[PDB]
Amino acid sequence: GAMGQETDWRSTAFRQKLVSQIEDAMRKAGVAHSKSSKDMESHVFLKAKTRDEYLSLVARLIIHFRDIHNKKSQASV
């Protein structure tokens, strides 16, 4: 798989993998404004209080991206 535990979201592998996801969704999402994925993920982390807060804000971000590019929906940035 990838990992067994779940009490170390501060691990490089963790943030790393997540960073790639956000970068992938954005790419296919077709957007441009903020600094960059790396910068976006970094902010979310420092903005989060726990592995949940981050994983939460991250998911919403990725999902919102898929919708914007998905079209035929609301999509409000």
Question: Tokens 């990838």 identify what position?
Answer: 2
Measured CA to CA, the distance from residue 44 to residue 26 in angstroms comes to 15
Measured CA to CA, the distance from residue 72 to residue 53 in angstroms comes to 29
Measured CA to CA, the distance from residue 18 to residue 54 in angstroms comes to 10
Q: Are 52 and 39 in contact (CB under 8 A)?
A: no
Domains in the chain, please, with CATH?
A: 1-77 (1.10.246.20)
Burial of 58 (0-12, 13-18, 19+ CB in 10 A): buried
> 43-47: long-range contacts (C-beta < 8 A, 24 or more apart)?
45/15
Region at 42 (left for phi over 0; alpha for psi -120 to 50; beta for the rest): alpha
- Interaxial angle between packed helices 37-47 and 12-29, expressed in degrees from 0 to 180 and rounded to the nearest 10: 130
